Amino acid sequence: MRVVVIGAGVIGLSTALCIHERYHSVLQPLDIKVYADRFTPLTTTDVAAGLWQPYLSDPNNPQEADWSQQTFDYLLSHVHSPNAENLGLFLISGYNLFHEAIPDPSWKDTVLGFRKLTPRELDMFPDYGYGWFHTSLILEGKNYLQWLTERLTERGVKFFQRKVESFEEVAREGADVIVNCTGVWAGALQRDPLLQPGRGQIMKVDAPWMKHFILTHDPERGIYNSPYIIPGTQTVTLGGIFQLGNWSELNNIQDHNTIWEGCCRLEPTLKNARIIGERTGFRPVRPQIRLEREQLRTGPSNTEVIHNYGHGGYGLTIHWGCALEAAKLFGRILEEKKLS
């Protein structure tokens, strides 16, 4: 069978890998190709810090809770494997700061060592009066993506750089299944008004003395829109920008300053941190992830489509559970073709 994955961000490469893993032994030939117009260094995925953390509150689809946790559990089980620095996976503890009390997150038990911040800890952060501490996981995109590529390449999965203009063009080329993992740009293949960009900007800084993450929460500013600091392997991520509908892939001076001054306020030690880089990206915002099947009509033959996009600011957090769900959908397609 001929499978075409459109997209080479986390969702794409993940799904690809997941499908190949689970079906390659059971499909006559399983021919999987990845089509993407941008690869690693240049994806939204490579701009992400990679911190595992879902939305605070119980969503539209609570199946997303399950997917985030399946991912957490999966990563945690390879955190101590000699392979982990190749996937850019490591454990990290830190703070969630709020101006007043709030309910414990659903995922409070998924993470390691969840607890409420003590007063002496809150004294370190004058502007916030309540919060949490826990241990979570960081999966760095730049690495993860490269890791995924290597696995895929070894499994015979071929990569092509191209902008796909239509599902039809791909089907007409003889794809049996199109897995659509196109992120913020999915609407160009099939209009989806519920999908929009959540523009972000981040700074990368040399501040290696920083061992914890600090995420602030501000109802006035909203999700992803208040100061955060997330230490990584080579560099500390400074962020706090969320701009719905903004399609400008250009670093903005005002946003730079907003990030810089919010983070320096959050942690004064930052003031002399050397700036290494700055990047913008597009969160594929949507009320729900679209993870589902669809048969495209096109010709005497109908083409099977697995949509897998709209993962907002929690795509690394959620990717594995989605990838496995995408894999079940594929297996169902096979059971229909009576190909297993």
Next chain:
Amino acid sequence: MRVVVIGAGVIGLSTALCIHERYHSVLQPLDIKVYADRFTPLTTTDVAAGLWQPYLSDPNNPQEADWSQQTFDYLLSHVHSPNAENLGLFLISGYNLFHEAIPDPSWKDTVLGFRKLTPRELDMFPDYGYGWFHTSLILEGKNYLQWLTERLTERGVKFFQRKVESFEEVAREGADVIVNCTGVWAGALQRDPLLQPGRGQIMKVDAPWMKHFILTHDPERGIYNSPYIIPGTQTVTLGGIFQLGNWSELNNIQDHNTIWEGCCRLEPTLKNARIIGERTGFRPVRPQIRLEREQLRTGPSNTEVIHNYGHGGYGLTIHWGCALEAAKLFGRILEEKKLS
């Protein structure tokens, strides 16, 4: 008054600074000079990771508990000051792992967010079945010492590189007070059989994905003698060697292997961590810190001596409280000379 501080490790440079801070405004001239035979890069203090952590259990002198805490409190209050990276001071959380249950440490409340390790956390460390998690502080010697040197130099404190053969030679030179902060080598100046070296060796490794500390505890091997990993600013410290009475300042192959293999076991991700350096040093082991006065007789004139040594493996942990205690002792000397 003429004061001679012997020693330019943390204890010396601290005490120096502390005495100058508190008395310079009240002493006609306060002439302070530091004599030391080795400075920064080459002190025991520069081989220390810098992790604040006292002995688990209530000691001989419980005044040491108060000193450790005064140091903790004092550091915590500057952790978020734009100055902190200059002293090499930062916050860091991590693990204490034991083979079975044990009582909470005395300092359980001094630290941030103390708690018992949960099962899922213990599953990460197959060889241990109990433990703690908390947040503490690291103060890196190489930096701290450099910071202390700069403060002192600005306060007119003069430094000389010399090996002092006797308290007498210093007193004869016209010192009014000798502050003895000679660490493991104090016995050469006045025999002290209770003082001995706790030889240590450490590796410094590039493992920047490592954001927590891990201290293991083994009654069979004893204090400082089982595997530890303590992330720093530029590098991760691998240790787990304690050899009482060993005066060999030479990296040992066996100990290297011991450290390497214990830490790799502790955290498999280390296996591909690049080795940056390796260093040995002498913990000035004693049943108690010697922090006290003594009048040397020498000639028609008696010389005042403040001893401040024997800080084992917790000198950075304890240094500030000792430094303030030494400063009181100095003030008392002044009140005797009726010089205030």
